[PDB]
Design a protein around this ligand. Structure first.
Ligand SMILES: Nc1ncnc2c1ncn2[C@@H]1O[C@H](COP(=O)(O)OP(=O)(O)O)[C@@H](O)[C@H]1O
Ligand SMILES: [Sr+2]
Ligand SMILES: [Sr+2]
Lengths: 336, 20
């Protein structure tokens, strides 16, 4: 399987070295509806006039990015997203900027956030959770092979496509790094202990986060939760986890090796690398090639009533996009 | 139950990232 990661790295390296730029403009798109709002702006359903295709457009306010000192991370986000290519990663179709904003135009993933199905249904059965888990396992194998750390795994960042497969989105904290890095970033419930302990960390954080995700999918609640972040960090650091009685012994054993506080012993971080995870008993029944090919039939298929259909997303309050007559932060975002 | 405790907690909706 390592030979296709080879071909993969080569395309990535070309794109990483010479990133595309300015591949569309705002007036090629009609804005329809907000799919989500975030720290620096929002994501909207848009429709491309010439083709009639629907896309999701992430809009970032340059000024807000600068205030929250997130310039570098924003540049990472776009540079990495335009270089990667994988069945479970969202595809960036276009990017451009104007006087006020940065725009990333992706494929529209119509099934909604994993988060919303999760909360509604309550929890996923182990066979259902495993199906999603396998996709993430292959995705992290691809990303880590390119020296990338993802750092923001959570149900709110995973979208379900029309086939019931996962699309990973939000590369805001993705970073290409050989060696360790130090930034405190991510989402509190999913933070690995070494991040909270300001230790200097690596790709092993993503495997911890997979641990948290599988627990949340199968239990319906996260292994560590409280009302305030600080209380959550205490729990994560202690590393004491309890499992629901319904968890299979195999699932409990996988989780104990992913939610390992000592990096020395955490799965995905040992000599056998990701093969320790792929070969664990919980995955005994998993056909990795089948999944990779999307030949496996999803356990769950969102309702979809024609394209442009947004019924699988919450409604948000809409805001018109304002563009200044003066260029803001032009130097800072030159490369975007 | 743990489920009851979670559902009564303030962090059952969409969770924002932290930038620090
Ligand atoms: N490709 C997409 N298709 C459909 N919805 C999307 C897409 N990408 C993002 N969204 C929606 O917008 C929300 C915010 O996108 P995100 O990239 O996570 O912005 P942020 O970094 O500010 O949190 C996502 O959780 C999802 O609901
Ligand atoms: Sr997000
Ligand atoms: Sr983000």
């Amino acid at each position: 399987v390592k030979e296709f990661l080879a071909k993969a790295k080569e395309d990535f390296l070309k794109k990483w070295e010479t990133p595309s730029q300015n591949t569309a403009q705002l007036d090629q798109f009609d804005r329809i509806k907000t799919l989500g709002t975030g720290s620096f702006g929002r994501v909207m359903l848009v429709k491309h006039k010439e083709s009639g295709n629907h896309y999701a457009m992430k809009i970032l306010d340059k000024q807000k990015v600068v205030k929250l000192k997130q310039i570098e991370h924003t540049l990472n986000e776009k540079r990495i997203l335009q270089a990667v290519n994988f069945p479970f990663l969202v595809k960036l179709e276009f990017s451009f900027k104007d006087n006020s904003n940065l725009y990333m135009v992706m494929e529209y993933v119509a099934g909604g956030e994993m988060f919303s199905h999760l909360r509604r249904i309550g929890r996923f059965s182990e066979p259902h959770a495993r199906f999603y888990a396998a996709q993430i396992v292959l995705t992290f194998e691809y990303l880590h092979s390119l020296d990338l750390i993802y750092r923001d795994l959570k149900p709110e960042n995973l979208l379900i496509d029309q086939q019931g497969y996962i699309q990973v989105t939000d590369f805001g904290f993705a970073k290409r790094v050989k060696g360790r890095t130090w930034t405190l970033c991510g989402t509190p419930e999913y933070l690995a202990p070494e991040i909270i302990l300001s230790k200097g960390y690596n790709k092993a954080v993503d495997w911890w986060a997979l641990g948290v995700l599988i627990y949340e999918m199968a239990a319906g609640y996260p292994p560590f939760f409280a009302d305030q972040p600080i209380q959550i960090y205490e729990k994560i650091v202690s590393g004491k986890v309890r499992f629901p009685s319904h968890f299979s012994s195999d699932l409990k054993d996988l989780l104990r090796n992913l939610l390992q506080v000592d990096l020395t012993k955490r799965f995905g971080n040992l000599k056998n690398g990701v093969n320790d995870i792929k070969n664990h008993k919980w995955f005994a029944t998993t056909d990795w090639i089948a999944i990779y090919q999307r030949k496996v039939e999803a356990p769950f298929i969102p309702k979809f009533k024609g394209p442009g259909d947004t019924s699988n997303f919450d409604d948000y309050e809409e805001e018109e996009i304002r563009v200044s007559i003066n260029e803001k932060c032009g130097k800072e975002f030159t490369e975007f | 139950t743990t489920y009851a405790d979670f559902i009564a907690s303030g962090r059952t909706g969409r969770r924002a990232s932290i930038h620090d």
